[PDB]
Amino acid sequence: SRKTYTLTDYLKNTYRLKLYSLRWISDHEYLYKQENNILVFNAEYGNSSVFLENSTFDEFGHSINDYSISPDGQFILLEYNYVKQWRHSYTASYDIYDLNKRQLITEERIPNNTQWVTWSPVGHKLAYVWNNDIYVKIEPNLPSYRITWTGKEDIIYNGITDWVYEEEVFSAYSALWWSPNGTFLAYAQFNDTEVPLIEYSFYSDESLQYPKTVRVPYPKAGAVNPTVKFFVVNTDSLSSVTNATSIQITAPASMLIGDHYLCDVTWATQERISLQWLRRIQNYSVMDICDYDESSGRWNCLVARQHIEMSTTGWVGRFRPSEPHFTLDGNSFYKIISNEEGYRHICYFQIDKKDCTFITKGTWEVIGIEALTSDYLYYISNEYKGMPGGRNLYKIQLSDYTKVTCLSCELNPERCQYYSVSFSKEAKYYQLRCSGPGLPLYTLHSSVNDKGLRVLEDNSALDKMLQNVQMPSKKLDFIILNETKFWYQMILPPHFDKSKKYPLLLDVYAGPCSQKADTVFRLNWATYLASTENIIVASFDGRGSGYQGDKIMHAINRRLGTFEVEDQIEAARQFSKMGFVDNKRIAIWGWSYGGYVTSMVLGSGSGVFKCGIAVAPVSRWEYYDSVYTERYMGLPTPEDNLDHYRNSTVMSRAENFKQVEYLLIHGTADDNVHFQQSAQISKALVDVGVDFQAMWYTDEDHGIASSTAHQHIYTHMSHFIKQCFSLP
């Protein structure tokens, strides 16, 4: 009977979660920023020295956006003039500061509008990208050596990814990789010459008389993809009297016979490098392993160390092929591959041996490999209590595969079921992050013992504030369809009385390998809707979802917008059948893929749903990018899968929208899910005489994330739902 979690509490962000972002610098030391001072902590004892003060940069002149400290502790890199591009890309200006002679390096500086910078893994070498070309500084104050000369805007990318490689494959802007001790610099080159352009208007400040046309290389499904090449250069032998020599590594002839992608690179040793290539049809992939050839000066990859990976139920990997984790000598490696019955487990390869041995099995999956010592492999899985939505740390004795220890399961089983981990330089220490279902909790441990040292942060500060307010509760459970369990979650209003009729909002994403039903603690729009408005906010992980093995994941292969959409409607039925749900007040909403599903559901004419909200929806797969879309659907040609492309659009269901209240929203500067998609839906509905409301967001992109827009959209949606549910 206090106060509730209000819309303003969400939008103005009055209830803050605290974090503990540390950055390991050694075997036993880490850095942590506090009230604007970077401190160094001693892992063992917890005592801490001041590393650099907030005083230092008072008269820098510019507003500093981000630090970055050379491995050898001697220099510190300063980022300003940050200007965002796409998801991970941006440009900035940079200044280096010498921590010995307490000063800024004034000459031979990094250019304004630099696109990427990185230190070497040891020492203070620098590599940066500027105007699509790569440059190297051996010493902060000395001049930089030019590596590539072909860089050209929107055409040739040297050391940075193009649009589709950034978003869909590497999840980074950076396309360069130092060797472990920093001798070698490997890098990719992307050629976008014949990649079609997407174009859209950008309006800018009202001062701008004529609108600008942004134009971007972007391959829609079936269209012409970029092409890639891979080089390695030696930074020790850089001349300043000669252009520097880059050794290309061609690619598997089994890949060269057609379109392909470079999708993983992993250094194995000081002179050994591993690459993973993938065919445009993403069910066949190939790992190469290359050694430096001291005589020739080149890199040679023997075909008898090559390693194939393929599928017939679907595609390779969760989103792309997994990455190898090599042993110190680099003659064997561990890699998460899918097993005989379709569960993802750790495999153990020898570099020149076709066959591997699985070191884990079970009806559960390894999420990721986290560390490797000479006789222990640390990993994360969803094994504990057979729940896919939970996450825990495990170690496995290398010499004995039946010696598996759980490192996090019983540390605090009621508060903590979703762990992630950050290890020290040689796995001597490790930090755990627990993010649900309780308030996040960060601890610290020593690996020698698996002994818990101290508590780093526990959000007890926030905890006082929160008992003053009537929070909602989260149920996590499953239902059964055709003798397989499918998980779901529900955000329940405070004092939830299981014999009342609550109105229900289905919160959907549902894309391949997604998981909306988990144990994470969140303070978001659903929190407001349950707490203040008494709406049950549910999510369901049906077919296509991940972490439950391949039979469930690959069930939508070549067949998008069929099962995952049906299963959302099914789950909705089962929920009303549970009795505490207002049968005639069910809504649905999602963003991106989620918007597409939402839209396909409302278009299905199932009668289950009163209304829906689709934010930046995909509307027909031929409009979305190739790397993603084709991964699941193949090519939109008659000889391939064009029928399913055509059969699966939102606009074909326009007629059925007559039975629902629809809300369509899209940012005009969406470079990801182009405005085109929503524009085509709206037209289809108009032509069939269906009423709805649209809402554009001038110059907003796929995030609708700018400060004032974020506030505005969540407000506009809230009002829409309240009205559709007859709430006050």
Binding site: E167, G511, S514, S592, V618, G703, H710
Partner: peptide, 6 residues
């Protein structure tokens, strides 16, 4: 294509 998140 990824989920977004405030």
């Amino acid at each position: 294509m990824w989920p977004v998140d405030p």
